[PDB]
Structure formats: C-alpha cells, structure tokens
C-alpha cells in the first residue's frame, strides 16, 4: 500500500538509515498525499564529485511503489543519465529505475545514483561550479 510505505520511508529518513551518504524527506511536511520528496547526496571519495552536495527532487506517483518514481537533480551535475539542461534522470540510463522492483525505495535510488557516480564514465567528467542550481 503506497501510503503506508511512504510513511515508513519518511520515518527512515528522519532516523538517517544507511551509511550516512544520502538523505531524503518530504518536500512539505503538511503534504498528506506524500507525493513530493527531497533527496540529497554527497559525492563519493576518489571522484570529481567527492564532497560536493547534490540536492534532488523526487516524485512518487499514485502507483508507487509499483512503478518507479520521477527523479531530477536541482544542483547542476554532469553525469550519464542526467539531462544536462534540467537535471532530469532518464530511467532507462539507471538500472535501478530501468528494472524497478517494488522492494526498492527512495533510499535505494539515492544509493544507486551515488554508486553510479563512481562508474568509469562519471568518475572523471567536467563539473559545473559547485552549488549551482538549474533554472526552475
């Protein structure tokens, strides 16, 4: 059931579950549909992304967690699968979204996005100045 899972994911985001390298939570604490979330990732060591903070907006639809959610970066980033114009994530480019399972969650998507920042293609790639945000 969509609502109750998002309630568990909310409490997990408040308890900071995981290896401390990603965080997620509601965009609006009064949103009773639990649709719009905000995520954050810190770059992984040994990469050009390392120690750069990246914010993301995540949208869980009515069929979540049956279907994957929409994901886009708000902080500028150059990475395969992320639209260079608005930071939208192409689900076909991310295996965790291309082959989505209802066991996955927002935490998993963030963890997958951070792991992929270590891939060969993304490891070394020119980054825009830190802290920039797409025009929205």
């Amino acid at each position: 059931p969509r609502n109750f899972r998002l309630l568990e994911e909310l409490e997990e985001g408040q308890k900071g579950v995981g290896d401390g390298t990603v965080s997620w939570g509601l965009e609006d604490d009064e949103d009773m549909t639990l649709t719009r979330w905000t995520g954050m990732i810190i770059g992984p060591p040994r990469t050009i992304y390392e120690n750069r903070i990246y914010s993301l907006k995540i949208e869980c639809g009515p069929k979540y967690p049956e279907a994957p959610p929409f994901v886009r970066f708000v902080t500028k980033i150059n990475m395969n699968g992320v639209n260079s114009s608005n930071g939208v994530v192409d689900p076909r480019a991310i295996s965790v979204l291309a082959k989505w399972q209802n066991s996955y969650s927002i935490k998993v998507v963030l963890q997958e996005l951070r792991r992929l920042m270590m891939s060969k293609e993304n490891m070394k790639l020119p980054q825009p100045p830190e802290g920039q945000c797409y025009s929205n």
Binding site: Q14, K15, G16, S23, M40, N51
Partner: protein, 73 residues
C-alpha cells in the same frame, strides 16, 4: 532530549539538546563533543541542509531524530 549524528563514514554519536535551542547552538554542542568546528559543519536532516538561522522546533526535530554531519574537504 537526545539526538544522533551520523557521519559520511558511518559513525553515529549521541548528543543532548533542547527543542528550543538554535542550530547555531546545536552546531556548538557537536563541537564541544567532537571538535569539528561550526565552519566546516554541514548538518543534514531528512533531505534538508539546516540553516544556522532557524531552530530545531522549525524542523520538527524530536527525540531519537538522527542528523547527518557532512564536512567540507
């Protein structure tokens, strides 16, 4: 109350605080206990980077709530 602070590596530490103290003061409690200076402290909570101006009450922070401490390299 008591709050947690998890770091990039995975270490989690407990800290005593009040629901009415400001993050600026909360950033100091983490200093006196861990030595990290408020300059290179970036505290995250549930997908939100905390701003030194606001207070914990504004972020609906309760007991057992875990903060994520990210530092600047």
């Amino acid at each position: 109350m008591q709050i947690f602070v998890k770091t990039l590596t995975g270490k989690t530490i407990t800290l005593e605080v009040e629901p009415s103290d400001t993050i600026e003061n909360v950033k100091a409690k983490i200093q006196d206990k861990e030595g990290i200076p408020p300059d290179q402290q970036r505290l995250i909570f549930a997908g939100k980077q905390l701003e030194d101006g606001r207070t914990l009450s504004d972020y609906n922070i309760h007991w057992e709530s875990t903060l994520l401490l990210w530092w600047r390299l």
